[PDB]
Ligand binder design. Structure first.
Ligand SMILES: Cc1cc(Oc2ccc(F)cc2OCCn2ccc(=O)[nH]c2=O)c(C)c2cc(C#N)ccc12
Lengths: 401, 547
C-alpha cells in the first residue's frame, strides 16, 4: 500500500520499442482486457507527452480458452536498475517433483511508483492504421517486469511464512510471475497440498526434476562394421575429443586403410577393439572441470532431429555443457515445426529457471523472419528469453543423436 | 454566447539539461516588417499570440515570404521527444465499402488548440522595428505553432479525446482520423448520413472546431497520398516515368521508387535490373548505361503501365486469398484478392543478398512477407495459393535441418512450379561406386590440385592455377560427380563443401557450385559422407593432392 521508489540505470532513457502488428481477434481481446483493467485502476490512459512504448500482445494458456495479456518487458527489464539478492535454492532441482503456480494476480494490489509509471507505457494497435493506437501506462505492479517480484519479495515472504513453518521439507522459489514449489510427495498428495497452498494464497503443470538428468556420449555396439560405420564412429570420436582429453582414433583409422566401398564389412583388430573400449570407459566418466559462473550468460543450442524429436545443450564455455537433453514430446504439434520449437524453448527455459534461477540466450535453428512471424502464436509462458538465429547447418546434429 | 468546452493542455518539457532557444533575429526589409506587423496584429486580435515584456530571455527568428514563417528548428532540437502514431498510413485495399462517405478538413488545426502556459515563454519571437531605432515588438504563442515538434501529436490526441464520445454514441458510423482530416463512413441512407455529419460537425463546433460549411470541398474521386479513391474502387495516381538518354543515380532511385509504388496494384512490375545499378551509390551525379535486360524490363513496365488497373475494397464476410507466382532471377509476384480477377492489391518480393539459395526458401520468405502485410492491412492471415506440390513441401520441411512453417495453403498449378531438384541419400548406397575425393591449394602460389580415388581403382588428379583450398575441395567433388554413374557414394573431408551442399541450393553465385548442382540433378542416388582430415583415414588421400 506504500510505493517504493524505483529508478533506472545511470545514463539510460526509458524504452522506446515498436509495437508489432496484431490480428483482429487479439486486438479485440486486448481492448476488452485493458478496458476492464482501466475500470479497476490497474492502468490509465496517457497522452502524447509520453514518448516511451513497450510491445504487448495476447495469448492463451494451458487448458484455458480465455485470452491473457502479455507484455514484452525485455527492454524495460534490461534498462531497469538491478534489484538486490536471494541465493538460488540449489535444492529445488534435487527435489522429486516441482509445481509451477501463477501468482501474477497478486501484483495488481501493490501500487507502482508514480514517477516510474511513464516507462511502462504500451500501445494497443489498430488495423490498417485507421485510428491511433490506445496508449496506457501501469498504475500498479505490471506482470513481466523484473522489479515487480523484487518489490513483492517481502509480501510474498509474509504470506508464505506459515506454510514454510509448517512444511520445512518443501522448497519454495519465485521467478517473475511464477512460483515454483518442490517436494518429494505423491502426485495425489502433491495435488492436494498444491490445492492447500493455492487456497492459502486465495484468502490472503506436473514437473519431475528426478526424471531428468544430464546425458552421456554413447557409441554403437556391433558384431560387424562397415567402412561407413567406422567412418562415422571416427568422426564422432574426433568430435568428442574436443570434450574428453584421452580420446584416440589412430587404431580405428588404421582399419580404413586403402580405398574400400562404404558398405564393405571390415572385421575389427584387437588393437581397434581395445581402443574403442578405452574410449567407452573415458566417455562413461563426467566432464573434467565443469563449473557454473553466475556472472556469465547461459547459452542454449537446439538441433532439429526430425520426427518430432529435438536435442539441446545448455553451456557457457564451448564443449563444457552444464546440461544436455532431448525434447520429443508430441502434443498437437505434429504438422508444425515452429510450434514444436516454441514449446521446446519454453521447456528448456523453465528447466533453466529451476536450475540456475535465470534464463539462457537461445540459438535457434530457424530463419529470423519465420520465427519473428509465428512465435507468439504458441507462446504460453509469462516470461520471454533472448534469442539469435543460426543460419548455417551444424555438423554435430547426428552426433547428439 | 454559448460556452465552448475547455480543451485541457498537454504538459510539455524541454529535453533534460537544456534551456529555451536564444537566437539572433534576422534583418528584414521595411516591407517585410510592415507585413509581419499587420499579420501579428490580426493574430494578436484573434488570440493566437500575445505581447510579452522584456523579461523573457528566449527568442526565435521570424521571416516573411505576405505570410509569416517562424523557424522553430532550434526549439525543435531542444523540445522533448513525443509519441508519433503517424508511422504508416491507411491502405486503400484495407478499407470497407460504405454507401455514404464524407470528408471533413478542419480549418485552423493547430491554432484551435491551446498551448501549455508554462511552455509559451519558449515560443517567444521578436519583430524588428523600422531602422531598429525602437526595441523590437515581442510576441509569444498561446496556441500550437505550426512547424513546432509537438503540434501534430498534441493536436491528434486532443482530436481523439474530442471524437471518442461521438464515436461511442455512434457505432453505426465509422470515423478515420488522419492529421487535419476526418473521414466518416456509413451504410446508412444518404439523408441520414448527411444528418449525422451535421451532428458530428456540431459536436466538433461545441469544442470550437470548424468544418467546411458549404457542400464539402472534396467529393469523389479523392486524390490522396498518391492514391485515387473512387466509390466502388481504388487505384494509384497516374505514373510519371521520365525518359532521358542519360541517367543519373538519383533518377534511378526515383524511377525505382515510382515503380515500387506502382507495383502495389499493377501486377508484373519488376525492378531488379534497375536496382543492380545502385551499387556504388552515395554519388548522385553519374551516367549509368542500361543493359538489354534492363531496357526490355523497363519496356515491359511501360507495357504494364499502359492501361489503368483498379483494386477493390475489403469485404469481411468473404475469405482472403493470396496467390504467388515465380518470376525468375529471385523475383516473385503476388496477388491478394477475394473474388477471382478482382484484386484487393498486388505486390512483389525480391530475394535477399546471399551466396546460395533455393526456390522453396524464397517462397517461404514471400509467404511471411505477405502474411505480415496482411495482418497490418486486414488484421488476418490469408489463405495461400502456391505453385508448389503438397508432397514437395512435405519432403522439404520434413528433411530440412531448420524449423519451417507455412500457414493454410493449397497448390495452384501455374508453371513454373517450385520443386526439389535433388535429394541426398540418408544411407550409403549398395552397389554404387565409392569416390574418396580431396583438394588442396598452395596459399602463396595459388596453385592447387583436386581429385579422387575409388574402390574400383579409378583415379584422377587435376592440377589447378589461381585457386584456393575451398575451391579445390569443391572441384574434387565436382570431378567425382562428372566421372561417376547414376548412383554414387562420395567421401570428403571438407566441412565447407558439405556445409554448402547440406543447405540444398538450387542456384549459386559460384559457377563451380552451380555445376555441382547441375551434376546432382542428373544423378539418381547420391550419398555424401564426411570424415575428419589428416586422421590417416585410409582411402582419403591428402598426400595425393599435396604434391
Ligand atoms: C482512408 C479514407 C477513407 C475514406 O472513407 C471511409 C471512411 C470511413 C470508413 F469506415 C470507410 C471509408 O471508405 C471505404 C472505401 N470508400 C472510399 C471512398 C468512397 O468514396 N467510398 C468508399 O466506400 C475516405 C473518404 C478518405 C478520403 C481521403 C481524401 N481526400 C483520404 C483517405 C480516406
Amino acid at each position: 500500500i506504500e510505493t517504493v521508489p524505483v529508478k533506472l540505470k545511470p545514463g539510460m532513457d526509458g524504452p522506446k520499442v515498436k509495437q508489432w502488428p496484431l490480428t483482429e481477434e487479439k486486438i479485440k481481446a486486448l481492448v476488452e482486457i485493458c478496458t476492464e483493467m482501466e475500470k479497476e485502476g490497474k492502468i490509465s490512459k496517457i497522452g502524447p507527452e509520453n514518448p516511451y512504448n513497450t510491445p504487448v500482445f495476447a495469448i492463451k494458456k494451458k487448458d484455458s480458452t480465455k485470452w491473457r495479456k502479455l507484455v514484452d518487458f525485455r527492454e524495460l527489464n534490461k534498462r531497469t536498475q538491478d534489484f538486490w539478492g536471494i541465493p538460488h535454492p540449489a535444492g529445488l532441482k534435487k527435489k522429486k517433483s516441482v509445481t509451477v503456480l501463477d501468482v501474477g494476480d497478486a501484483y495488481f494490489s501493490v501500487p507502482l511508483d508514480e514517477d516510474f509509471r511513464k516507462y511502462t507505457a504500451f500501445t494497443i494497435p489498430s488495423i490498417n492504421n485507421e485510428t491511433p493506437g490506445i496508449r496506457y501506462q501501469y498504475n500498479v505492479l505490471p506482470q513481466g517486469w523484473k522489479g515487480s517480484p523484487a518489490i513483492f519479495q517481502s509480501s510474498m515472504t509474509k504470506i508464505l511464512e506459515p506454510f514454510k513453518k509448517q512444511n520445512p521439507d518443501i522448497v519454495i522459489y519465485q521467478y517473475m510471475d511464477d512460483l515454483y514449489v518442490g517436494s518429494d510427495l505423491e502426485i495425489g498428495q502433491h495435488r492436494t497440498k498444491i490445492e492447500e497452498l493455492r487456497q492459502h494464497l486465495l484468502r490472503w503443470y506436473e514437473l519431475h526434476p528426478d526424471k531428468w538428468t544430464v546425458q552421456p556420449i554413447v557409441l554403437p555396439e556391433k558384431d560387424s562394421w562397415t567402412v561407413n560405420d567406422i567412418q562415422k564412429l571416427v568422426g564422432k570420436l574426433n568430435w568428442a575429443s574436443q570434450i574428453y582429453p584421452g580420446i584416440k582414433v589412430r587404431q580405428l583409422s588404421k582399419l580404413l586403410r586403402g580405398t574400400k566401398a562404404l558398405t564393405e564389412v571390415i572385421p575389427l583388430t584387437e588393437e581397434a577393439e581395445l581402443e574403442l573400449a578405452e574410449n567407452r570407459e573415458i566417455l562413461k566418466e563426467p566432464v573434467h572441470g565443469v563449473y557454473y559462473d553466475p556472472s556469465k550468460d547461459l547459452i542454449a543450442e537446439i538441433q532439429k532431429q526430425g520426427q518430432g524429436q529435438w536435442t539441446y545443450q545448455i553451456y557457457q564455455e564451448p564443449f563444457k555443457n552444464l546440461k544436455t537433453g532431448k525434447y520429443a514430446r508430441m502434443r498437437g504439434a505434429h504438422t508444425n515445426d515452429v510450434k514444436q520449437l516454441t514449446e521446446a524453448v519454453q521447456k528448456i527455459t523453465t528447466e533453466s529457471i529451476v536450475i540456475w534461477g535465470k534464463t539462457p540466450k537461445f540459438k535457434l535453428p530457424i530463419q529470423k523472419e519465420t520465427w519473428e512471424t509465428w512465435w507468439t502464436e504458441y507462446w504460453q509462458a509469462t516470461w520471454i528469453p533472448e534469442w539469435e538465429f543460426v543460419n548455417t547447418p551444424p555438423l554435430v546434429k547426428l552426433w547428439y543423436q | 454566447m454559448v460556452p465552448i468546452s475547455p480543451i485541457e493542455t498537454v504538459p510539455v518539457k524541454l529535453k533534460p539539461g537544456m534551456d529555451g532557444p536564444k537566437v539572433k533575429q534576422w534583418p528584414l526589409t521595411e516591407e517585410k516588417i510592415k507585413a509581419l506587423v499587420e499579420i501579428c496584429t490580426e493574430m494578436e486580435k484573434e488570440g493566437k499570440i500575445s505581447k510579452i515584456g522584456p523579461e523573457n530571455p528566449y527568442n526565435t527568428p521570424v521571416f516573411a515570404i505576405w505570410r509569416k514563417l517562424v523557424d522553430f528548428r532550434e526549439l525543435n532540437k531542444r523540445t522533448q521527444d513525443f509519441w508519433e502514431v503517424q508511422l504508416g498510413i491507411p491502405h486503400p485495399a484495407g478499407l470497407k465499402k460504405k454507401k455514404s462517405v464524407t470528408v471533413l478538413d478542419v480549418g485552423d488545426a493547430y491554432f484551435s488548440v491551446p498551448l501549455d502556459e508554462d511552455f509559451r515563454k519558449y515560443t517567444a519571437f521578436t519583430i524588428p522595428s523600422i531602422n531598429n531605432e525602437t526595441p523590437g515588438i515581442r510576441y509569444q504563442y498561446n496556441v500550437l505553432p505550426q512547424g513546432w515538434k509537438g503540434s501534430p501529436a498534441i493536436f491528434q490526441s486532443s482530436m481523439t479525446k474530442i471524437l471518442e464520445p461521438f464515436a461511442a454514441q455512434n457505432p453505426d458510423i465509422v470515423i478515420y482520423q488522419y492529421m487535419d482530416d476526418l473521414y466518416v463512413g456509413s451504410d446508412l441512407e444518404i439523408g441520414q448520413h448527411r444528418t449525422k455529419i451535421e451532428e458530428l460537425r456540431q459536436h466538433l463546433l461545441r469544442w470550437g472546431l470548424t468544418t467546411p460549411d458549404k457542400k464539402h470541398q472534396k467529393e469523389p474521386p479523392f486524390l490522396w497520398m498518391g492514391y485515387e479513391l473512387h466509390p466502388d474502387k481504388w487505384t494509384v495516381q497516374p505514373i510519371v516515368l521520365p525518359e532521358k538518354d542519360s541517367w543519373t543515380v538519383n533518377d534511378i532511385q526515383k524511377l525505382v521508387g515510382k515503380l515500387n509504388w506502382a507495383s502495389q496494384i499493377y501486377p508484373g512490375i519488376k525492378v531488379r535490373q534497375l536496382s543492380k545499378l545502385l551499387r556504388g551509390t552515395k554519388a548522385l551525379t553519374e551516367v549509368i548505361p542500361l543493359t538489354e535486360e534492363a531496357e526490355l524490363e523497363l519496356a515491359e513496365n511501360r507495357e504494364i503501365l499502359k492501361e489503368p488497373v483498379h483494386g477493390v475494397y475489403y469485404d469481411p464476410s468473404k475469405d482472403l486469398i493470396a496467390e504467388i507466382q515465380k518470376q525468375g532471377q529471385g523475383q516473385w509476384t503476388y496477388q491478394i484478392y477475394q473474388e477471382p480477377f478482382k484484386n484487393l492489391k498486388t505486390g512483389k518480393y525480391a530475394r535477399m543478398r546471399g551466396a546460395h539459395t533455393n526456390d522453396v526458401k524464397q517462397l517461404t520468405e514471400a509467404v511471411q512477407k505477405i502474411t505480415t502485410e496482411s495482418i497490418v492491412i486486414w488484421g488476418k492471415t490469408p489463405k495461400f495459393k502456391l505453385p508448389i506440390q503438397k508432397e514437395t513441401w512435405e519432403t522439404w520441411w520434413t528433411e530440412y535441418w531448420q524449423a519451417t512453417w507455412i500457414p493454410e495453403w493449397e497448390f495452384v498449378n501455374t508453371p513454373p512450379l517450385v520443386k526439389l531438384w535433388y535429394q541426398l541419400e540418408k544411407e550409403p548406397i549398395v552397389g554404387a561406386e565409392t569416390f574418396y575425393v580431396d583438394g588442396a591449394a598452395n596459399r602463396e602460389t595459388k596453385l592447387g590440385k583436386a581429385g579422387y580415388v575409388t574402390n574400383k581403382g579409378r583415379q584422377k588428379v587435376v592440377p589447378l592455377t589461381n585457386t584456393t583450398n575451398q575451391k579445390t575441395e569443391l572441384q574434387a567433388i565436382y570431378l567425382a560427380l562428372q566421372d561417376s554413374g547414376l548412383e554414387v557414394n562420395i567421401v570428403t573431408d571438407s566441412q565447407y563443401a558439405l556445409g554448402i551442399i547440406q543447405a540444398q541450393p538450387d542456384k549459386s553465385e559460384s559457377e563451380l557450385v552451380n555445376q555441382i548442382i547441375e551434376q546432382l540433378i542428373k544423378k539418381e542416388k547420391v550419398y555424401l559422407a564426411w570424415v575428419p582430415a589428416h586422421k590417416g583415414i585410409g582411402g582419403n588421400e591428402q598426400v595425393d593432392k599435396l604434391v
